[PDB]
Amino acid sequence: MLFYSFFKTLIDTEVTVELKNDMSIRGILKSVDQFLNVKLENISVVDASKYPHMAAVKDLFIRGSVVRYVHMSSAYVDTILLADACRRDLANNK
Amino acid sequence: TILPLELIDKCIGSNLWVIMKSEREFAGTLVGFNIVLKDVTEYDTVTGVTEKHSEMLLNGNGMCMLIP
Amino acid sequence: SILYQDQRIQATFTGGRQITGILKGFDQLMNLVLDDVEEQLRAIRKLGLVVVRGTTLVLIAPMDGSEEIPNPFVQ
Amino acid sequence: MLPLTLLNATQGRPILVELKNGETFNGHLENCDNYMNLTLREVIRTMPDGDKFFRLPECYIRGNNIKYLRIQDEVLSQVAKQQAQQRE
Amino acid sequence: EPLDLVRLSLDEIVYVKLRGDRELNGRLHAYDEHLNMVLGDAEEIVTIFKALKTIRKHYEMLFVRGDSVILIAPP
Amino acid sequence: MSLADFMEQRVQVITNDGRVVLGSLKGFDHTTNLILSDSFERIISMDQDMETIPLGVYLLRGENVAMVGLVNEELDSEIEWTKIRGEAIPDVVH
Amino acid sequence: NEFLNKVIGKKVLIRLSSGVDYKGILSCLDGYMNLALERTEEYVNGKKTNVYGDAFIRGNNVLYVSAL
RNA sequence: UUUUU
């Protein structure tokens, strides 16, 4: 539940999801679930001239198994609290 | 009829040939069960490169067929 | 199990390998024990009696009545 | 509508199945399970390049290899109606 | 117990080798049992094919999904 | 799922083999299997004009789903998809 | 799985399905075949390409571990 | 046997 809880905290902030098909999609995180399925709103595909297929899509669901990275600005991430949460996560499941 | 796990169990101590879904093979004498094989020769069936190993734990996820 | 004993069937595996053989036994993991199995290469080679791992099957069909046909559909 | 309710409701009717290897199968779906494993009857199997064709009296397809299924519109219509009958 | 190795790298710099000829160097701030990770101040190296070129990118903060990860080591 | 937000609406699926199929989302489940009705595929190319293939009712296995986008009808109405060229979407490689 | 005791603490070969090999002293193994090695050397096309001082290898990539 | 490959 550690990274699902974290992603819940990045909701309403801007992320870029790079997929295992090498597309990267930028948008406002609106939802994330236990599988790390993710919903982005107001997406813009990074290399839109390569890929006009999504020229009419504003709200977008990305399946969790196809994410390579989700990368985001450090401004909305507290890395000590994240690290503490992690230490407490691996203590709990131990 | 025939029972698969009983068949490999028949093979403990015997020579077993295991062929993966990729075009790779191993042939050696079976030690136990992911499988542990003894004195196995691994065959790359495309490049033809063959190499032998004295004993190895071979991951089971990629094995296709077992042949006594 | 949604599923021939001692009748000949063909089976195809993930990764592309495709074999034929007469079904002589099975269990519920869909392990198969098939003999006089021969895999058709991508020409054939014959593997003798093989136990097939149920997790790798994609397709099992009976051989009796499977045939190559010309285009049966509309142009 | 759950995808498995539609698949279960298409038992006994025609179905087109395309597998990851690109082959497609046209036949009557007689049965399926909750893994999406299928057994079909009276099938035409078409190889990936549309090159070669086989007729199969019946066939079993393990669900983990399916890319997609095509189902008649009336099956979906029948199920929508049935779910709309079950509410009252 | 294998994971204890990466447990010792929390808040330290790691090298991550990924499927697809990609490599990351960053500060490990979190991970789980799949090796999902969040790396801070990360550099990505992509090798493009003897290699034809490599492309380096920097990420202020970067989550990496565990199923692409091949190995994790000190830098 | 976040997919409950797309129910009964025009949806655009990008599959793991790079295909684009549009349709009304009639249902989904926790592995992301989908029912689309009145669906069709779009084949965008660089060499040739966009192709549209009718597909009818389409059940998609979740293992093969990369993205599900909500199609904005006004924005999509604004686009002349016939004269659109673009690169092939890559396959997802796991 | 008495292979483990026989092998833990000695040099091992991990061949990944990708074909890259890693040799080093084996610290640890687990049920999914995740590995910890103590001074890993990496080999591509058979040539040494990198050496890592300790390595965690995710088991899904390991095709086999062979003894030294 | 579909989301930790």
Show residues of chain E in contact with F93, CB under 8 Å. 19-20
D50 three-state secondary structure: coil
Residue B44 is part of which domain span? 1-68
Would you say the C-alpha torsion C33, C35, C39, C45 has a positive or negative sign?
Answer: positive
Domain containing residue F59: 1-94
- Both tokens of G21, joined, read 């090999």
Looking at the structure of chain B, the number of domains it has is: 1
CB atoms within 10 A of CB C15: 14
Nearest alpha-carbon partner for A60 in A44, A83, A74, A75: A44
How far apart, in whole angstroms, are the C-alpha atoms of residue D70 and residue D18? 9
Phi, psi of F73 (to 5 degrees): -65, -35
Measured CA to C1', what is the nucleotide nearest C29? H1
Strand H nucleotides with an atom less than 7 Å from a protein beta carbon: 1-5
For residue F1, the number of C-alpha atoms closer than 13 Å in the C-beta half-sphere is 26
Taking the C-alpha atoms of residue E59 and residue F63, their distance in angstroms, rounded to an integer, is 29
CA–C1' A21–H5 (A): 14
Token pair recorded at residue F35: 């029912």
C70 vs A38: CA distance, rounded Å? 46
Distance of CA B11 to CAs B28, C8, G3, Å? 11, 25, 18
A80 token code pair? 């000590």
Distance CA A36, CA A63 (A): 8
Instruction: Measure D85 CA to H5 C1' (Å).
Output: 42
F94 touches chain E (CB under 8 A): yes
3-state secondary structure of E68: helix
Q: Which nucleotide is nearest to F61 (CA to C1')?
A: H2
Distance of CA G50 to the CA centre of its chain: 14
User: CA B20 – C1' H3 distance (Å)?
Assistant: 25
Indicate the number of domains in chain D: 1
* A74/E61 touch (CB, cutoff 8 Å), yes or no: yes
Element (H, E) at C17: none
C1' of H2 to CA of F32 (Å)? 8
Q: Domain range holding G38?
A: 1-68
Quote the number of domains for chain F: 1
Neighbours of B39 (CB within 10 A): 14
Task: Using DSSP, state whether G68 is helix, strand or coil.
Answer: coil
Counting one residue from chain B and one from chain G, the pairs whose CB atoms sit within 8 A come to 35
CATH number at residue G46: 2.30.30.100
Domain with D79, as residue range(s), is 1-88
* Alpha-carbon torsion angle G43, G45, G46, G52, nearest 10: -10
**Spatial distance between the Cα atoms of G28 and G38, rounded to a whole number of angstroms:** 9
Q: Max CA-CA distance within chain C?
A: 44
Tokens, residue D48: 């990936």
Q: Provide, as residue numbers in chain F, all residues whose Cβ is less than 8 Å from the Cβ of A21.
A: 16, 18, 66, 89-93
Question: Chain E contacts of F94, Cβ < 8 Å?
Answer: 19, 67-68
- Give alpha helix (H) positions in D1-88: 3-9, 73-86
- Report the number of distinct structural domains present in chain A: 1
CB distance E32–A2 less than 8 Å? yes
User: What's the number of domains chain G is made of?
Assistant: 1
Which residues of chain G are within 8 Å of residue E66 when distances are taken between CB atoms?
58
Domain containing A40: what range? Answer: 1-94
As a whole number of angstroms, the distance between CA G20 and CA G17 comes to 8
The answer to whether the C-beta of C50 is closer than 7 A to strand H is no
Domain with E31 in it: what CATH number? 2.30.30.100
For chain C, the domain total comes to 1
Cβ–Cβ gap G56/E5 under 8 Å: yes
**Does the beta-carbon distance from C33 to B8 stay under 8 Å?**
no
Dist. CA D80–CA F26, nearest whole Å:
9
User: Which CATH number fits the domain that encloses residue B50?
Assistant: 2.30.30.100
What's the reported resolution, in angstroms, to a tenth? 2.3
Nearest alpha-carbon partner for B65 in C54, F5, F48, F38: C54
Residue F93 approaches strand H within 7 Å at CB: no
Place of tokens 């983990």: D64
- The CATH code of the domain that includes C52 is 2.30.30.100
Phi, psi dihedral angles at B21 (to 5 degrees): -65, -35
